[PDB]
Design a protein around this ligand. Structure first.
Ligand SMILES: OC[C@H]1O[C@@H](O[C@H]2[C@H](O)[C@@H](O)[C@H](O[C@H]3[C@H](O)[C@@H](O)[C@H](O[C@H]4[C@H](O)[C@@H](O)[C@H](O)O[C@@H]4CO)O[C@@H]3CO)O[C@@H]2CO)[C@H](O)[C@@H](O)[C@@H]1O
Ligand SMILES: *[C@@H]1O[C@H](CO)[C@@H](O[C@@H]2O[C@H](CO)[C@@H](O)[C@H](O)[C@H]2NC(C)=O)[C@H](O)[C@H]1NC(C)=O
Ligand SMILES: OC[C@H]1O[C@@H](O[C@H]2[C@H](O)[C@@H](O)[C@H](O)O[C@@H]2CO)[C@H](O)[C@@H](O)[C@@H]1O
Ligand SMILES: [Li+]
Length: 360
């Protein structure tokens, strides 16, 4: 590429998500739901580099698989889709997705090497167009959650490491989208202006890297792209869906030198309204379905693609109240319970997403 990194490529559906579905879901399902689950195992969702171990195992593995498929003559050729998700003091406003590294224990250096090695593999696989979402939740937390001790303490590290990632992974075959929360997070009129300055400043301090295409929204969340009727839980936010958020956000970013395109996560937003009782409820939300299949055909000037970033069926957090990573949000009445550790397969949730899929 070129313009839109989603143009002229197919998105790779990774083997690890398909294996989960076949190994852990299908055996427990009816014949009809096993069929539907087989179709979903083939829908491309982003592969998360959530642990350092993934870099020289699952990440390099997937890159090799993609090269093999393209060498065999894939047409359009396959592009890889990955999430960089291992900041030290990760998930700073919550408990459920705390990561392996901490700032206190050499986390920043650990992250720099993690990034360095990712860069090496991208160089090694420069033949594979690679699309990255950078660090879901991180910068959105910087906008709204500076009152939270873990966030404010991590703030300077987050900003240094984000710039570092954007500079290091800035390669011609790569497109990056910085995570930018969602309409119910950064779309609030009181949050949208500080968000615009923070993103524009990170972008400029990173030297306006060519590989930075724009922002991802709705990652691991559930908002409508475009809905006529604002869900009750969205009131009084005028930016009640991702379309409203992105259209309000883009000119503010543009005014500060960051002319962003967007991708929107549609993997868990097929059923509207969702089962959320309040908008801020993010964990394993009840009454959700698989949404619009990933496509570059968005019909909207600012959106490069609808994508599945959060892999449906992988938990957002454990509901085990005695667990170290227990977060009360995962124990609420609109959260599906019992639920396993974040990232772990969550059969009952997977089932819900299948049943509620929309389109079917
Ligand atoms: O998305 C997955 C991710 O979620 C993280 O939790 C996020 C929620 O996703 C998000 O909905 C929530 O958004 C808040 C926002 O931060 C507040 O600024 C805003 O405050 C409103 C308030 O509700 C109104 O009463 C008031 O009048 O207006 C203000 C705005 O000025 O409320 C919204 C909705 O509740 O923020 C959460 C983070 O704190 C998780 O932490 C993460 O683990 C998940 O992966
Ligand atoms: C993160 O993972 C990398 C591998 O991707 C680790 O780097 C390797 O460390 C081992 C030592 O156990 C060596 O055998 C390798 O040669 C190292 N480098 C590479 C590029 O493979 C690294 O140690 C991990 N980081 C942390 C903080 O544990
Ligand atoms: O434990 C590794 C497991 O994690 C998955 O990534 C998770 C991440 O762990 C979690 O904190 C966040 O909320 O969601 C992502 C995506 O579900 C990863 O996708 C799996 O491959 C992996 O087995
Ligand atoms: Li999360």
């Amino acid at each position: 590429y070129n313009g839109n990194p989603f143009s002229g490529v197919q998105l790779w559906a990774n083997t690890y998500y398909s294996s989960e579905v076949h190994t852990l879901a299908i055996p427990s399902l009816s014949p009809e739901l096993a069929a539907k689950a087989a179709k979903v195992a083939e829908v491309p969702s982003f592969q998360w580099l959530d642990r350092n171990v993934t870099v020289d195992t699952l990440f390099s593995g997937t890159l090799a698989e993609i090269r093999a498929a393209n060498q065999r003559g894939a047409n359009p050729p396959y592009a890889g889709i990955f999430v960089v998700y291992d900041l030290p003091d990760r998930d700073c406003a919550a408990a459920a997705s705390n990561g392996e590294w901490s700032i206190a224990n050499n986390g920043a250096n650990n992250y720099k090497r993690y990034i360095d090695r990712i860069r090496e593999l991208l160089i090694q696989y420069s033949d594979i167009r690679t699309i990255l979402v950078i660090e879901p939740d991180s910068l959105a937390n910087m906008v709204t959650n500076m009152n939270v001790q873990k966030c404010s303490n991590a703030a300077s590290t987050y900003k240094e490491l984000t710039v570092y990632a954007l500079k290091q992974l800035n390669l011609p075959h790569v497109a990056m989208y910085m995570d930018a929360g969602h309409a119910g997070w950064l779309g609030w009129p009181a949050n949208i202006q500080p968000a615009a300055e923070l993103f524009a400043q990170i972008y400029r301090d990173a030297g306006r890297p060519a590989a930075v295409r724009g922002l991802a929204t709705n990652v691991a969340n559930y908002n409508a792209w475009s809905i006529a009727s604002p869900p009750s839980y969205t009131s009084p936010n005028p930016n009640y869906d991702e379309k409203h958020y992105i259209e309000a956000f883009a000119p503010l970013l543009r005014n500060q030198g960051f002319d962003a395109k967007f991708i929107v996560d549609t993997g868990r937003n097929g059923k509207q309204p969702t089962g959320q009782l309040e908008w801020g409820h993010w964990c394993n939300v009840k009454g959700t379905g698989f949404g619009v299949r990933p496509t570059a055909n968005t019909g909207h000037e600012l959106v490069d693609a609808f994508v599945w970033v959060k892999p449906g069926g992988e938990s957002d957090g454990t509901s085990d109240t005695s667990a170290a990573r227990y977060d009360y949000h995962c124990g609420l009445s609109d959260a599906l319970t019992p639920a396993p550790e974040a990232g772990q397969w969550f059969q009952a949730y997977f089932e819900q997403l299948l049943i509620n899929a929309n389109p079917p």
